[PDB]
Scaffold this active site. Structure first.
Site, mmCIF file in Angstrom:
data_model
loop_
_atom_site.group_PDB
_atom_site.id
_atom_site.type_symbol
_atom_site.label_atom_id
_atom_site.label_comp_id
_atom_site.label_asym_id
_atom_site.label_seq_id
_atom_site.Cartn_x
_atom_site.Cartn_y
_atom_site.Cartn_z
ATOM 1 N N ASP A 184 -2.446 -7.785 4.732
ATOM 2 C CA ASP A 184 -3.384 -7.251 4.052
ATOM 3 C C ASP A 184 -4.665 -7.933 4.396
ATOM 4 O OD1 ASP A 184 -1.618 -5.962 2.621
ATOM 5 O OD2 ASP A 184 -1.572 -7.481 1.060
ATOM 6 N N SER A 214 -10.268 -8.152 2.798
ATOM 7 C CA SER A 214 -9.062 -8.297 1.704
ATOM 8 C C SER A 214 -8.977 -7.019 1.310
ATOM 9 C CB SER A 214 -9.400 -9.102 0.432
ATOM 10 O OG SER A 214 -8.398 -9.292 -0.178
ATOM 11 N N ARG A 215 -7.618 -6.562 1.714
ATOM 12 C CA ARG A 215 -7.278 -5.111 1.169
ATOM 13 C C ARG A 215 -6.795 -4.834 -0.331
ATOM 14 N NH1 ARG A 215 -6.029 -2.221 6.152
ATOM 15 N NH2 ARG A 215 -5.240 -0.448 4.903
ATOM 16 N N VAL A 216 -6.758 -5.767 -1.018
ATOM 17 C CA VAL A 216 -6.461 -5.917 -2.332
ATOM 18 C C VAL A 216 -7.704 -5.631 -2.924
ATOM 19 C CG1 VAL A 216 -5.879 -7.251 -4.413
ATOM 20 C CG2 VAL A 216 -4.236 -7.211 -2.344
ATOM 21 N N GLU A 229 0.718 -1.066 0.023
ATOM 22 C CA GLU A 229 0.098 -0.003 -0.102
ATOM 23 C C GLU A 229 0.718 1.194 0.075
ATOM 24 O OE1 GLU A 229 -2.723 -0.057 3.069
ATOM 25 O OE2 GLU A 229 -4.121 -1.717 2.201
#
Ligand SMILES: Nc1ncnc2c1ncn2[C@@H]1O[C@H](COP(=O)(O)OP(=O)(O)OP(=O)(O)O)[C@@H](O)[C@H]1O
Ligand SMILES: [Mg+2]
Lengths: 479, 179, 59, 53, 502
Positions: free
Chosen positions: E338, E363-365, A191
């Site tokens: 993530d 889920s950060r993706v 990120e």
């Protein structure tokens, strides 16, 4: 000009032995002259945390101690970590040490500043409560920001928090003469790279002509030792107060997030052997936070306003990490996963976002009266959603037929197009001033605009642009 | 190393260095080590129960027969006042390591199956002053039979740095044939 | 997989026989060397060992 | 079930083939330790020229 | 198997070209031995993290380099280490030999084989404590990692280069989520590393038996440190596994790595640290346990096209205690990772298997992992299982409601029957698009819940055989095309006709 010797290496913590007279004082940078894996010289930078007595300091390394040997020579710099500041920092990603980690050459600067520094004095403060004008309609109405205050984002990902930050960087650079510094305290490298490329993509970092850029990025990663992470917030802040004091600008500081500044200080203090405070934090947590937050202030020269993300551990607001953070905060912006599912951008919750600035002696009565009517209209519509699913609109009272239609028009008119999404959606963004925001929601709540359709307020800037989209739809429906 | 025993010994050396009695003080410190070896003598000074006043009178008599240096007599008196006589033995041993540092000398240890001659010792001292930077070099010998034929020297600030060729050939050939 | 095991046990048999043979050789050479004259061997040995010492210090 | 029984019987057969091969090679190394002795003498005589310069 | 003819040369082969070089080593003497720690006097010039070797052959890592001694933590039992005995620093810092020939070998935490199958031919070495790729060495996660579970690969999608966390309480199915992910990539060319820290040795043997039957060991390394081993080997076992996965990743190859409990690594570094007298924190852990796992998991991400676009998808497994997500080691890894895959035992006992709590799991993706065929269809599965999540209180009261609500209760109870897979039955991506297109577009509302499992198994084997043109549309174009939406609906109405007759 002082040479020390490493006395011990226990983890990231070093003890360095000095000659009896020549002696560093606390927070000065130590440069450990080390050797690498292959055999080349590579130096390790540190910071004095404790004076142990008997001419021996205790340091916490800013990098890896893996391969340091007891008895290597250490340079006392005589000053804390000095970090390059100026317009040479714009568009660049920095280390804790002020070293560029974005592979674009060295920083061709002539100015540095120490990251450890006292606050501005009692004389030098700007006592005037100014509102900060973000150009965003939900913020400038319902959760206003101080100019020189500390703001909290309560949002994850999938809520458009990265788009909301880039809009604030672009608005402060255009509307005011401002800059921004993003500080990544303990940030992921996935990120961290995702944010740098979307800043390139949204034109906020100008990848072709750098120093025409709007941000200076300072990234401390998670695989950094805890000493570096404690320092990144300060390093970011020292760049932010060069633009405040010397260039007399209005800066945004961004700490993402302020909890990882707390846990990195909790880790260093546990490595230094301090007896911990309540709930496991460092006993110096009230002052470690207070050292960072009291430099973030409006002086007579400029101001720095910090919008800093806040993580609540165990969903406990009485936990010492939010409780020490929330004391310094002046507004909270709650971003909503549910409002992003409706399609509202920016997905700021209007009802859970707060401010200390939304008082009628500060924002004036015309703004305070209207922000309460908007909140009371949106709170009444939040109550009626179970009744509309049971009765429907035709069975509600005539007074409450309006407070659904007006509140559905407010939820659309709170949304806004952004300049940073002109590649993503194509629709051009709108900077909406505080003057056009209050005149916008006066017309919706006075009922003059009850003839317009609902989907004339969605993604429009001004209230004139609302009627323009509506008269287009009356000319598009007839065809 | 920086422990209380080391800390005291370093002070004792520093005062000698100032007054140029480094040779004179060192002899006295070596003389003390013979004194405090004896279980009975050490026990009398070390234990808390015997009265401190009695300890000084006995100590003074011991100093007179010994004929110790004026500071060296003080240094023991300082230890007794400040209760650290329980760690005299560590302090005395520690002083020797400090004393070499001040001179700029270095120490070496060379070991063999059979006793050897002085020219070999001088040439090992040459090599150790080369690779070490002794201002001057120093040497010690300990005869051990369980090797084959070689010599092992041992040097450094501690007894650390070791090079040898006697049995390291044989153990090396075991560990090289497993390759 | 069984032929893989048999090839490994060929390797292990070769390795243990080689090491036991070599320990037999070592202790035999050790008995003979400890049977050797102390004066003749050592003088050449110390002299050559100390020459190699000073040589590697030059190196 | 029929081919699983065939699998298990073949697996026993290969196990007994394993034990025969391993016992054979252990007897083989017993033979080369019980023999091969001028190798022992010469291998002692060769390293004695290497321990000394 | 002829030896004694060539033994009379091999003894003279090692003596030939033998250097016998005299070089300076740092020696020490042993002060004290206890609990797998050795305090060592001397080693004046040893560097931090260096392997030291003892008499009787024990190796240890010099971690505490203190002013009086060196705290060496042993990589084995120190039962034969004697007080006053010598010890010498080796000169190197924790390597493993690294090679292509680890695929199929159960090795331990120094990458020596424990499967009893011979040595491993290796020519290069990787450092165990290697640094992670920086910010400019990476690329955004955009390729999917197909785990074979519908509940993950539709709604909590893991991409290549992503660190995802499999987390839940004991006996929930955490290993089975990780094992079935490894079993799915028989056709994809990822290389899986299965690191097993602190497990029972019987369960390491059952995983390799599960892997060898299903052909998973042709692309798999199993790193294994059984709980009998010392805590140094358990601490360094995922760093050994991550160093093997960085070998293939820098050789342009995509990799998956699973750490079978990061919880037991943190307890194994707490063991060494408390024995090295390092000052503790919450739950007696040091301050470095975040910096333990963040130094491990950040090494696993997706590389740039200037490096060759290798990936290392980490799936760390963390076990919580009575669902205490706010415990110290779950709090660290949720911050580092993530995404999180929350597994609940109240869904495991109710029959929802794999017991994914898809509401809390994130889920950060996001949807950047999924292919374009999967983005289209799983846009409806997420909304309609969220509409069923708001109406879980209404399921007892389905009759006393309007048809706009009651059909949503009828739809959501079949959308949870989509998510149910048996153990070690991973689905291909084409089989996942059929199952979510059928369920989220009204083609299962006629069936009883006992038959929704039996219908989809027969419809997945129908299109596999009768309509093979569907799989070529999704494998090549990777988009749910208007051609394939027509081809899938012809398969449904022919299967529903054959399933109703039965
Ligand atoms: N999808 C599934 N359907 C049915 N059973 C399953 C499924 N997944 C796992 N199981 C069973 O549940 C049991 C526990 O699973 P598993 O061994 O993966 O647990 P775990 O999470 O590793 O727990 P622990 O760490 O305590 O071993 C196993 O016996 C396994 O066979
Ligand atoms: Mg398990």
């Amino acid at each position: 000009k002082n040479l020390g010797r490493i006395a011990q290496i226990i983890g990231p913590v070093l003890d360095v032995a000095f000659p009896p007279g020549k002696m560093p004082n606390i927070y000065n940078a130590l440069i450990v002259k080390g050797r690498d894996t292959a055999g080349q010289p590579m130096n390790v930078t540190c910071e004095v945390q404790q004076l142990l007595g008997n001419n021996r300091v205790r340091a916490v390394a800013m990098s890896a101690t893996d391969g340091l040997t007891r008895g290597m020579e250490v340079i006392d710099t005589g000053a804390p970590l000095s970090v390059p500041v100026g317009g040479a920092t714009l568009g660049r990603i920095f280390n804790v040490l002020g070293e560029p980690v974005d592979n674009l050459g060295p920083v061709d600067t002539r100015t540095t500043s120490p990251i450890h520094r006292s606050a501005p004095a009692f004389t030098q403060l700007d006592t005037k409560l100014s509102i900060f004008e973000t150009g965003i309609k939900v913020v400038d109405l319902l959760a206003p920001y101080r100019r020189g205050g500390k703001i909290g984002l309560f949002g994850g990902a999938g809520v458009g928090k990265t788009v909301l930050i880039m809009e604030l960087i672009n608005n402060i650079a255009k509307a005011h003469g401002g800059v921004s510094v993003f500080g990544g305290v303990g940030e992921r490298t996935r990120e961290g790279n995702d944010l740098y490329m979307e800043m390139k993509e949204s034109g906020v970092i100008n990848e072709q002509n750098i120093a025409e850029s709007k941000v200076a990025l300072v990234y401390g990663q998670m695989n950094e030792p805890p000493g570096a992470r404690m320092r990144v917030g300060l390093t970011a802040l020292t760049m932010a107060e060069y633009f405040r004091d010397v260039n007399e600008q209005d800066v945004l500081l961004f700490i993402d997030n302020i909890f990882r500044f707390v846990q990195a200080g909790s880790e260093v203090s546990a490595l230094l052997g301090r007896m911990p405070s309540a709930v496991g934090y460092q006993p110096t947590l009230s002052t470690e936070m207070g050292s960072l937050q009291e430099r973030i202030t409006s002086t007579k020269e400029g101001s720095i306003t910090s919008i800093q993300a806040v993580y609540v551990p165990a969903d406990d607001l009485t936990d010492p990490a939010p409780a020490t953070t929330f004391a310094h905060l002046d507004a909270t912006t709650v971003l909503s996963r549910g409002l992003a599912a409706k399609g509202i951008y920016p997905a700021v919750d209007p009802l859970d976002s707060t401010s200390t600035m939304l008082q009628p002696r500060i924002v004036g009565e015309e703004h305070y009266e209207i922000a309460q009517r908007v909140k009371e209209t949106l709170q009444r519509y939040k109550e009626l959603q179970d009744i509309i699913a049971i009765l429907g609109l035709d069975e509600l009272s005539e007074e409450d037929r309006l407070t659904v239609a007006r509140a559905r028009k407010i939820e659309r008119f709170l949304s806004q197009p952004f300049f940073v999404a002109e590649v993503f959606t194509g629709s051009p963004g709108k900077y909406v001033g505080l003057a056009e925001t209050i005149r916008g929601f006066q017309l919706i709540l006075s009922g003059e605009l009850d003839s317009l359709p609902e989907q004339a307020f969605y993604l429009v800037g001004n209230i004139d642009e609302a009627t323009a989209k509506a008269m287009n739809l009356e000319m598009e429906s007839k065809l | 190393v920086d422990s209380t025993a080391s800390r005291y010994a370093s002070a004792l050396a520093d005062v000698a260095d100032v007054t140029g009695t480094l040779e004179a003080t060192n002899s006295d410190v070596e003389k003390l080590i013979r004194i405090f070896s004896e279980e009975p003598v050490y026990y009398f000074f070390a234990n808390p129960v015997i009265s401190i006043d009695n300890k000084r009178s006995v100590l003074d008599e011991i100093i007179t027969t010994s004929g110790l240096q004026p500071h060296t007599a003080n240094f023991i008196n300082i230890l007794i006042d400040s209760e650290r006589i329980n760690l005299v033995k560590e302090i005395l041993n520690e002083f020797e390591d400090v004393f070499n540092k001040i001179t700029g000398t270095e120490v070496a240890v060379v070991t063999s199956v059979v006793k050897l001659e002085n020219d070999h010792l001088a040439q090992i001292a040459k090599g150790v002053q080369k690779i070490t930077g002794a201002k001057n070099v120093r040497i010690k010998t300990v005869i051990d039979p369980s090797l084959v034929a070689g010599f092992t020297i041992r040097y450094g600030n501690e007894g650390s740095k070791l090079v040898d060729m006697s049995v390291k050939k044989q153990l090396e050939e075991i560990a090289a044939q497993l390759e | 997989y069984k032929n893989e095991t048999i090839q490994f046990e060929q390797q292990k048999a070769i390795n243990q026989v080689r090491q036991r043979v070599f320990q037999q050789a070592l202790q035999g050479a050790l008995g003979t060397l400890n049977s050797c004259l102390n004066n003749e061997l050592h003088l050449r040995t110390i002299n050559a060992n100390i020459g190699m010492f000073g040589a590697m210090n030059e190196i | 079930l029929e081919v699983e029984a065939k699998l298990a019987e073949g697996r026993k057969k290969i196990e007994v083939e394993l034990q025969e091969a391993l016992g054979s090679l252990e007897q083989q190394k017993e033979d080369t330790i019980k023999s091969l002795d001028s190798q022992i003498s010469a291998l002692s005589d060769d390293i004695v020229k290497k321990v000394l310069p | 198997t002829i030896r004694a003819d060539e033994i009379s040369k091999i003894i003279r082969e090692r003596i030939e070209g033998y250097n016998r070089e005299v070089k300076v080593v740092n020696t020490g003497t042993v002060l004290q031995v206890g609990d797998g720690i050795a305090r060592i006097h001397g080693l004046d010039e040893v560097m931090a993290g260096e392997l030291v070797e003892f008499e009787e052959g024990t190796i240890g890592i010099a971690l505490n380099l203190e002013s009086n001694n060196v705290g060496v933590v042993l990589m084995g039992d120190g039962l034969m280490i004697q007080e006053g005995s010598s010890v010498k620093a080796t000169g190197r810092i924790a390597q493993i030999p690294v090679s292509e020939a680890y695929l199929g070998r159960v090795i331990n935490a120094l990458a020596k084989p424990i499967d009893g199958r011979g040595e491993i031919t290796a020519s290069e070495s990787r450092l165990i404590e290697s640094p992670a790729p920086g910010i400019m060495s990476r690329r955004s996660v955009y390729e999917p990692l197909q785990t074979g579970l519908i509940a993950i690969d539709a709604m909590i999608p893991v991409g290549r280069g992503q660190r995802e966390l499999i987390i839940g309480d004991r006996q929930t199915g955490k290993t089975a989520v990780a094992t079935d992910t490894i079993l799915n990539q028989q056709g994809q060319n990822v290389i899986c590393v299965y690191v097993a820290i602190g497990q029972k040795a019987s369960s390491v043997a059952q995983v390799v038996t599960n892997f060898q039957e299903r052909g998973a060991m042709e692309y798999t390394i199993v790193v294994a440190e059984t709980a009998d081993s010392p805590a140094t080997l358990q601490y360094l076992a995922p760093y050994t596994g991550a160093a093997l996965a960085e070998y293939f990743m820098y050789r342009e190859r995509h990799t998956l790595i699973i750490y079978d409990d990061l919880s037991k690594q943190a307890q194994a570094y707490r063991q060494m640290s408390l024995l090295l007298r390092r000052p503790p924190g919450r739950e007696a852990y040091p301050g470095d346990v975040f910096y333990l796992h963040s130094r491990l998991l950040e090494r696993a991400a997706k590389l740039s096209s200037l490096l060759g676009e290798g990936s290392m998808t980490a799936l760390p497994i963390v076990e919580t205690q009575a669902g205490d997500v706010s415990a110290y080691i779950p709090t660290n890894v949720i911050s580092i990772t993530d995404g999180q895959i929350f597994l609940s035992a109240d869904l495991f006992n109710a029959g929802i298997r794999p017991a994914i709590n898809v509401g809390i799991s994130v889920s950060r993706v996001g949807s950047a992992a999924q292919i374009k065929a999967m983005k289209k269809v799983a846009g409806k599965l997420k909304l309609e299982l969220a509409q069923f999540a708001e109406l879980e209180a209404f399921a007892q009261f389905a009759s006393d409601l309007d048809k706009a609500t009651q059909n949503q209760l009828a739809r959501g109870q079949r959308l949870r029957e989509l998510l149910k897979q048996p153990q070690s039955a991973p689905l291909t991506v084409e089989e996942q698009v059929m199952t979510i297109y059928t369920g989220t577009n009204g083609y299962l509302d006629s069936l009883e819940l006992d038959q929704v499992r039996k219908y989809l198994v027969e419809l997945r084997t129908y299109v596999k055989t009768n309509k093979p043109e569907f799989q070529e549309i999704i494998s090549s174009t990777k988009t749910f095309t208007e051609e394939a939406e027509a081809l899938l609906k012809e398969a449904i109405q022919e299967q529903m006709e054959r399933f109703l007759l039965q």
